[PDB]
Symmetry: C3
Subunit: 144 residues, 3 copies
């Protein structure tokens, strides 16, 4: 049928929403004074990264047109920065350096995540225009 | 094969279980004294609502018989009440009014969630009877 | 195609990662001094157990060769021990006996979970060797 544009929109939408939960999770890792919860949240981030990477493996072959591939390569670049700083706040907090963890959260993590979110937004909007275009086509074929 | 009654039972069962986690999550949002965790939990509820709404989009077209459609429309009505009060405790807590957040949790949220859970239970039990009926049929066809 | 060895590796990998998040979750249940969060975490474990059991239902029929079935029966045995002690720390903590909850965490839970993780590791590595073997075969057929 026409389930690939649908799947792309669904996956990218979930990706956009998960990043926004992760931003608050990272904030709790930096600011929370409950050590065993910080450990649990860091473990959960360690698993979410795997589920995300699997997702990226899934959508990679589905994004072929120029603008979407430009945005996706841009997200792949910024995501390394994002992970690097997120893991730095996590490692800093686990090592008893909370003031520097919070500092890295404000000076590096939030800007990198903000760029990440902007690129996910642009990707989502582009994919919506693409989805409506594909729909108008599939209807122009099922009709005639 | 006969995977639609199976999928309906699986999805409704997960829905019933997720609501029960959400009830404890909302309780933590009202009662916890860890602000950054409250922020993380509220963000997580914001994403779970999306995943749930997608689910409802999925099962909607699968529920066609009378009793199940009556129960499902009843759940759709009570779910607005549920979300409204859950978001109210969340907004009250984020705005520094914790006593009123806890009060809304006891006076509005728990009753609305209780109704929600009862309707999910009735839906699940009905779907189990339906699943065994469909199974007896599919076996009556694969046999003969 | 050849998506069953792929699915087995994906599911077992996720299983291995989820157990590692659960170990930190159980630790937070024993050590955290935030009662409403402990309640939320226990509810979340109650749902994760269901999602896991569904998974085991899924892979059961997919594991047929001798070594993998030996490892899987071993995991099924150790998982009862694991759940029993995890639920014991959870029930002990909910009942106001935190010192004994932490004690059960060190003396029973961590050893049982460690055995669990070792068996998941052996299963994963075996499934990777199996996946590459199946790949070499499928290529030996698509070629010729």
């Amino acid at each position: 049928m026409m389930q690939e544009p649908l799947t792309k929109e669904r996956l990218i939408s979930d990706w956009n929403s998960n990043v926004s939960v992760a931003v608050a999770r990272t904030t709790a890792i930096a600011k929370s004074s409950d050590a065993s919860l910080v450990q649990f949240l860091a473990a959960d981030a360690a698993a979410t990264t795997k589920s995300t990477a699997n997702v990226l493996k899934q959508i990679e072959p589905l994004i072929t047109q120029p603008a979407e591939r430009e945005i996706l390569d841009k997200i792949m670049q910024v995501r390394k920065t994002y992970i690097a700083s997120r893991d730095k706040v996590s490692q800093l907090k686990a090592d008893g350096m909370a003031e520097e963890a919070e500092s890295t959260l404000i000076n590096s993590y939030v800007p990198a995540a903000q760029g990440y979110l902007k690129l996910l937004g642009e990707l989502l909007n582009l994919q919506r225009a693409s989805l409506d275009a594909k729909a108008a086509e599939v209807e122009q074929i099922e009709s005639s």
